[PDB]
Amino acid sequence: MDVLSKGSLKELLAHLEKTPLEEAISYRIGTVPYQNVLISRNEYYNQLYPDTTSLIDGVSREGQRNVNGLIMSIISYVVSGSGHYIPNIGFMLLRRSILDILTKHDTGLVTNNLNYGIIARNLTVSKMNCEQRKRMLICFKLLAYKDGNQNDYEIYLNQNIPLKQIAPNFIPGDMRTVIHNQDQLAIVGIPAYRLTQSTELSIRDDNAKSYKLGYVDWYNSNSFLRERSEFNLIRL
């Protein structure tokens, strides 16, 4: 909820600094992705409604323990609000924040030898919207600049013209580009008037709508409940 509410590059990067990797990953096994399933949408049809499970559905799915699984889990958290199930990551990586995993060399993780085309295919980039596409490219650029693979990032953008049009305009090493950036990246937010409490056809659309509807209640009643647990504890 908090990650999807951020609407600026500054706010998104600030949030990733304060958020440990534990929030990105999940401890629920979920189901295997890329499965043609029939779900129930009784609002519209009596028959079952076909759909395909993906990594950006907003529901935890099983993921491998390699470097790609950890990166895919982080990107899913940014664009869908929920991560995947990577078994036994280890306390050493869980305490580190998301940005250090993306943009630092002290994590002990070798993020080189990463193919952005393969990762984009696995995350179903053809199904995500402009804001989700923009957030995914931000993670790619941070990973590319840390490992000195700026050429491979440019090659990926050249092959994908639609992604090149909406590419973020910041440079990871320069602070001036971050402050002057005018991108809008807010998936959820408090809307003028309201939105009907009705279901949607797709798994992604319905889960995204559930986040928007619950944001208003989460905004008002989160400070006290979080503080009660935060008090008398040490942060990871």
């Binding site: 043609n36 519209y44 049809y45 028959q47 409604y49 076909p50 759909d51 053809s126 199904k127 919207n129 402009c130 804001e131 013209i161 639609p162 049009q165 909406i166 809008q184 807010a186 809307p191 003028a192 008037y193 939105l195 009907t196 009705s198 949607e200 056809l201 797709s202 659309d205 995204a208 709508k209």
Partner: protein
């Protein structure tokens, strides 16, 4: 055995998966409502010899006053409406227009984005397959009215299997000369000119006698849930204009003569119920596009 299928039912390309949420659907409904007011205001401007009604309508649609030296594109709403139409057709479209623009344009008017409060009848004939034996030649021509021409050069009568899918509600089947048709594992009736069939109750067999060719005309009707403001006359006009304007020029896609062929072809995919809702939203957008472009030609 030889297989014959309808041309418009072959390889339906995937449709876009963006701008189908409640906020985007409200934007399309707002666009149609404002486009209708644009057409009405221009007529009122012509009648009353004053440009006041048109100025108000264009100011709301485009968020700017009309100017004599500048051109009337339609503003940011025109650009957004064109972009969403491109994204609806194919999944390879850029889908560039942001959400903050979609929400700001849906707030201009207060109309629900409901797309299931009415229905429309689409008269396209789905002929999935017409299995034919050797020596018998079958040709399927047409979509709105499918004429099937069959003749046999063999010694004996042949059996021709017809499959109309499981989506169409009723199919009325008329032949040039009286012919016998019956379902699987059913007695053949006396030859008669016309047949009324539900495509759901299994494949059908038509007895083809030796001699002159038998030409059979098919007509089908299918009910698809559509918004109240749906208008087939306007939607079909918008479909042609968008195709003429290059909005549908995207690689690795199929093209259709009319909108009803498009919606039935996507309905008959492996999982066609997914695409019907997206296609319906595209139809309402084309109706808004047609009304806006006729008021503001470019």
């Amino acid at each position: 055995a030889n297989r014959a299928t309808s041309a418009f039912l072959d390889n339906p390309h995937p449709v876009g998966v963006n701008y189908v949420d409640e906020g985007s659907r409200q934007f399309v409904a707002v666009a149609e409502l404002l486009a209708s007011k644009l057409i009405d205001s221009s007529r009122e401007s012509d009648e009353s010899n004053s440009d006041v009604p048109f100025v108000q309508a264009y100011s709301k649609f485009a968020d700017d006053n009309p100017r004599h030296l500048r051109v009337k594109t339609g503003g940011k709403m025109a650009n957004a409406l064109t972009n969403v139409i491109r994204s609806y057709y194919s999944i390879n479209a850029p889908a560039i227009v942001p959400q903050v623009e979609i929400d700001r344009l849906a707030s201009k008017a207060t109309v629900s984005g409901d797309m299931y409060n009415s229905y429309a009848i689409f008269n396209s004939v789905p002929i999935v397959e017409v299995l034919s034996p050797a020596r018998t030649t079958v040709s399927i021509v047409g979509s709105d009215r499918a004429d099937v021409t069959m003749l046999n050069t063999g010694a004996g009568a042949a059996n021709i299997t017809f499959n109309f899918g499981q989506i169409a509600e009723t199919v009325i089947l008329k032949g040039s000369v009286p012919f016998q048709l019956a379902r699987l594992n059913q007695p053949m009736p006396a030859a008669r000119f016309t047949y009324k069939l539900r495509p759901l109750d299994g494949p059908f067999i038509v007895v083809l006698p030796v001699g002159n060719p038998l030409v059979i005309s098919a007509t089908a009707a299918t009910r698809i849930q559509v918004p109240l403001a749906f208008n087939k006359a306007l939607v079909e006009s918008g479909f042609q204009t968008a195709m003429n304007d290059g909005l549908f020029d995207i690689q690795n896609v199929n093209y259709y003569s009319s909108f009803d062929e498009f919606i039935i072809s996507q309905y008959h995919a492996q999982d066609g119920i997914n695409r019907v809702s997206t296609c319906v939203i595209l139809g309402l957008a084309l109706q808004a596009y047609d009304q806006m472009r006729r008021a503001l030609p470019v």
